[PDB]
Amino acid sequence: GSHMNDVLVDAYNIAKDSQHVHGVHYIRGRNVGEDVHLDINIYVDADLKVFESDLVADAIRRKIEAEVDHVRDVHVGVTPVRIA
Amino acid sequence: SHMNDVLVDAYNIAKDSQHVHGVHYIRGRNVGEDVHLDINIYVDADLKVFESDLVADAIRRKIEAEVDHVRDVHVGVTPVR
Numbered sequence: 001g002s003h004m005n006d007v008l009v010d011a012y013n014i015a016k017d018s019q020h021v022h023g024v025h026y027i028r029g030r031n032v033g034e035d036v037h038l039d040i041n042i043y044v045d046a047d048l049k050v051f052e053s054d055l056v057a058d059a060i061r062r063k064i065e066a067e068v069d070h071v072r073d074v075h076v077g078v079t080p081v082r083i084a
Numbered sequence: 085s086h087m088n089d090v091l092v093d094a095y096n097i098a099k100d101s102q103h104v105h106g107v108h109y110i111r112g113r114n115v116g117e118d119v120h121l122d123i124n125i126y127v128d129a130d131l132k133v134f135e136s137d138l139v140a141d142a143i144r145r146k147i148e149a150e151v152d153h154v155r156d157v158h159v160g161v162t163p164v165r
């Protein structure tokens with residue numbers, strides 16, 4: 001039936017403990033038929049380079065797509081934060 | 085942090101409410117210790133405006149009553165024919 005709960009938990013848990021993630025900013029799940037479309041946005045250090053943040057988002061995407069059932073069209077966005 | 089609990093509990097409250105056809109989407113945002121929650125439910129297009137309003141409101145009340153760590157809960161509706 002609904003797979004949202006599993007998708008959101010498993011995806012969040014992947015994102016929150018990936019490298020360079022200071023914390024999850026937001027997560028959004030939308031049901032479309034049997035699929036869940038997922039948008040996650042992660043906080044990263046404002047001083048990270050673009051190439052590095054691009055790799056992080058892509059890794060998180062790859063891992064969610066590999067391990068989380070019922071997911072479609074996963075998007076991982078990044079928000080800079082100043083780290084004291 | 086508390087996101088996982090907030091999303092699951094709130095989704096479950098919404099989905100099991102009478103007059104909800106299904107959950108359309110759910111969004112959690114972390115702001116410090118708080119989670120801000122937006123949830124959107126599918127309802128029958130023929131519900132009256134007053135009725136859809138009562139459903140959304142009841143969901144909001146229940147989530148605010150039962151789900152720790154939530155702030156600024158918004159329940160929106162999407163009509164379905």
Ligand SMILES: [Mg+2]
Pocket residue numbers: 065066067068
């Ligand atoms: Mg896959």
